[PDB]
Write a protein that binds this ligand. Structure first.
Ligand SMILES: [Cl-]
Ligand SMILES: [Cl-]
Ligand SMILES: [Cl-]
Lengths: 103, 97, 97, 111
């Protein structure tokens, strides 16, 4: 519960093993102090993932601790952390335009 | 093709225009940005067809669609949104210097 | 006829562009109103001939001129001023009776 | 200032203003939407005879005067006139305006 991982049962694991080999890792891109990368589960696997692993108000997966993502089949170093993109509040509209310089 | 607001729709928005806020403009290596903040009570008055069913928030509006809502600025500003990845995509970060 | 800035003057204003603030759009019977709040420190960078020695504020500016300062807005606005009368003139008004 | 207590002139004060009352010029009446306007121009010399506490320390103009006060100066006006004052915003503030647009040009059929 946002601190304690929820261990899979024996039957859930059997349902997941078939997909383990179909998991895809993308090349990492750098930044100031962060290496980034994304994991892609095949669309079919989502039907197998436990309901309590999904965020109710979004349909995506909730942030998972290490033992949780490893149980899904993902293999990675220890330092990796799962994060979420953050959408602004509904009353803030964003705009942008191509810059104009001087000379 | 934008879906223009109606007379009666625009009239229903009137009382809120007075309080729409505009931020300064900040810029990076190639783009310029700014945000507009609408009064919270105004969202209720907005026609549902201006919203994204999945997000439960306003969809991307064309020039004429945001002008309809009472927003004024150089018409060169283009709206955009920060979209969340598909469920089957997991995002990870790592310091490790 | 506008007094265009010099490349040397324009460059001096460059760092303030991101802090210029804009107010909401207000209206009345037949006009829309709005003000722009410049960063105080910026006033020291604006050319002398852009000021008004009668009050110490910026003289009325033409669109091209205020756009040359880093102010961005929609098409249509026109800058104005408040003219204070001399000590021998008193002003009166009454709710249209 | 929560104006309330009018500072009426004394007999001597008013007596000092008399040779000036004849020349007080009143402009025509103007009007917009909410109010009606009037500009009163008094002789420049009359200002030297006016009481110091009637002026404004900062702007050096006359301070807002209650009905009983300006009437005591010799300004003959009808009931309902209030003296107003214009205000200039701080130097870093610029003012802008423009004619309000909407479906306001009614035609004979289905505007
Ligand atoms: Cl506009
Ligand atoms: Cl703008
Ligand atoms: Cl004023």
């Amino acid at each position: 519960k946002s601190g304690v991982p929820r261990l899979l049962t024996a039957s859930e694991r059997e349902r997941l093993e078939p997909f383990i080999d179909q998991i895809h890792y993308s090349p990492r891109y750098a930044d100031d102090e962060y290496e980034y990368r994304h994991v892609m589960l095949p669309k079919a696997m989502l039907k197998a993932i436990p309901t309590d692993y999904f965020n109710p108000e979004t349909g995506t997966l909730r942030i998972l601790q290490e033992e949780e993502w490893r149980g899904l089949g993902i293999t990675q170093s220890l330092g990796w952390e799962m994060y979420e993109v953050h959408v602004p509040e509904p009353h803030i509209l964003l705009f942008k335009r191509e810059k104009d310089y001087q000379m």
